[PDB]
Write an enzyme that holds these catalytic residues in place. Structure first.
Site, PDB file in Angstrom:
ATOM      1  N   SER A  58      99.405  86.516 -78.932  1.00  0.00           N
ATOM      2  CA  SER A  58      98.423  86.433 -77.703  1.00  0.00           C
ATOM      3  C   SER A  58      99.014  84.430 -77.752  1.00  0.00           C
ATOM      4  O   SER A  58      98.472  84.897 -76.046  1.00  0.00           O
ATOM      5  CB  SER A  58      97.077  86.253 -78.240  1.00  0.00           C
ATOM      6  OG  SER A  58      96.996  88.497 -78.224  1.00  0.00           O
TER       7      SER A  58
ATOM      8  N   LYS B 267      99.657  84.334 -73.603  1.00  0.00           N
ATOM      9  CA  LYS B 267      98.716  84.535 -72.385  1.00  0.00           C
ATOM     10  C   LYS B 267      98.230  83.803 -71.772  1.00  0.00           C
ATOM     11  O   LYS B 267      98.222  83.683 -70.568  1.00  0.00           O
ATOM     12  CB  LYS B 267      96.810  85.489 -73.004  1.00  0.00           C
ATOM     13  CG  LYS B 267      97.012  87.246 -73.592  1.00  0.00           C
ATOM     14  CD  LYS B 267      96.264  86.521 -74.465  1.00  0.00           C
ATOM     15  CE  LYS B 267      95.699  89.051 -75.005  1.00  0.00           C
ATOM     16  NZ  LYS B 267      96.370  89.273 -75.570  1.00  0.00           N
TER      17      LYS B 267
ATOM     18  N   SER C 297      91.131  86.806 -76.369  1.00  0.00           N
ATOM     19  CA  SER C 297      92.111  87.773 -76.469  1.00  0.00           C
ATOM     20  C   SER C 297      92.245  88.481 -76.159  1.00  0.00           C
ATOM     21  O   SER C 297      93.013  90.015 -76.818  1.00  0.00           O
ATOM     22  CB  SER C 297      92.638  87.410 -78.089  1.00  0.00           C
ATOM     23  OG  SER C 297      93.877  86.832 -77.696  1.00  0.00           O
TER      24      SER C 297
ATOM     25  N   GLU D 135     101.133  94.531 -74.042  1.00  0.00           N
ATOM     26  CA  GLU D 135     100.687  94.721 -75.225  1.00  0.00           C
ATOM     27  C   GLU D 135     100.479  96.393 -75.317  1.00  0.00           C
ATOM     28  O   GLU D 135     100.084  97.316 -74.055  1.00  0.00           O
ATOM     29  CB  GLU D 135      99.119  94.828 -74.833  1.00  0.00           C
ATOM     30  CG  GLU D 135      99.212  93.199 -74.420  1.00  0.00           C
ATOM     31  CD  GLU D 135      99.223  91.538 -76.068  1.00  0.00           C
ATOM     32  OE1 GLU D 135      99.045  90.672 -76.088  1.00  0.00           O
ATOM     33  OE2 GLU D 135      99.236  92.643 -77.301  1.00  0.00           O
TER      34      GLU D 135
ATOM     35  N   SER E 155      98.118  86.253 -83.172  1.00  0.00           N
ATOM     36  CA  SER E 155      97.968  87.130 -84.543  1.00  0.00           C
ATOM     37  C   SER E 155      98.859  88.421 -84.307  1.00  0.00           C
ATOM     38  O   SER E 155      99.275  89.168 -82.871  1.00  0.00           O
ATOM     39  CB  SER E 155      96.664  87.321 -85.078  1.00  0.00           C
ATOM     40  OG  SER E 155      96.057  88.695 -84.084  1.00  0.00           O
TER      41      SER E 155
END
Ligand SMILES: [Cl-]
EC number: 3.5.2.6
Length: 262
Positions: free
Chosen positions: A44, A47, A104, A140, A211
């Protein structure tokens, strides 16, 4: 120092994994680097680039952040803390950016990716900024697999530090857009156990965690120490075992090592 290098090596050994660090200190234009040219799965932390791409797009489409995006059941992925509240309604691009950066939220990331034209468009934006290392390959949730040896969805600590510096402290974005990115990152809710945990309580931090598989545990931060010039810090970490658990403490420890004495 060889002191700091030795401390990072010992932290890495103790952790059992592979640690990547890049600190830029804007006081003196110095760096501390550890495996800073190796690739790590961003998870992440990517992002930030996606939100920055939307902010850049907004500079030529001033009502862009207010544009509404439908959220459907079919959009849900593995981690949807904000988007799940908006199913069957719309969210603005500003709300999606905030949700991605501050919670997130993976649906939010997918909407930012889609808006700008997909992973290859996010990557092309990175190239336009002068980051020739970053690659966003997937959406994702698959971008988090973090398989050792797989270059998909990776960057290096040096590249990400340089790019984050450009985005938050440099001139990649217009002043309104840069300020918005910084404000979003300072409002993050997911980072208190990561870089922030290794810094004095008084320091101000904007960060983005990541993560994923192989116990991958990441954080990228802009840091305003008390009465000092800002720092940029990237701490990437990944482990040998597919089902390794998270190690946010390793990121905290790395942050403490590289900022000790400032
Ligand atoms: Cl403290």
């Amino acid at each position: 120092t060889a002191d700091v290098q030795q401390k990072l090596a010992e932290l890495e050994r103790q952790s059992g994994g592979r640690l990547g660090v890049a600190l830029i200190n804007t006081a003196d234009n110095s760096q501390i680097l550890y495996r800073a040219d190796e690739r790590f799965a961003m998870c992440s932390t990517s992002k930030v680039m996606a939100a920055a791409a939307v902010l850049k797009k907004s500079e030529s489409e001033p009502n862009l952040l207010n544009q509404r995006v439908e959220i459907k059941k079919s959009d849900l992925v593995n981690y949807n803390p904000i988007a799940e509240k908006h199913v069957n309604g719309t969210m603005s691009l500003a709300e999606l950016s905030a949700a991605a950066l501050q919670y997130s939220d993976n649906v939010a990331m997918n909407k930012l990716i889609a808006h700008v034209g997909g992973p290859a468009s996010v990557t092309a934006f990175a190239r336009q900024l002068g980051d020739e290392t970053f690659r966003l390959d997937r959406t994702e949730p698959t971008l988090n697999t973090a398989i050792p040896g797989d270059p998909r969805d990776t960057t290096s600590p040096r590249a990400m530090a340089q790019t984050l510096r450009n985005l938050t402290l440099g001139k990649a974005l217009g002043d309104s857009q840069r300020a918005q990115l910084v404000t979003w990152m300072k409002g993050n809710t997911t980072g208190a156990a990561s870089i922030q945990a290794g810094l004095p309580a008084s320091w101000v931090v904007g960060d983005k965690t990541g993560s994923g598989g192989y116990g991958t545990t990441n954080d990228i931060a802009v840091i305003w120490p008390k009465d000092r010039a800002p720092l940029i810090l990237v701490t990437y970490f990944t482990q040998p075992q597919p089902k390794a658990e998270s190690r946010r403490d390793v990121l905290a420890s790395a942050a403490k090592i590289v900022t000790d004495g400032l």
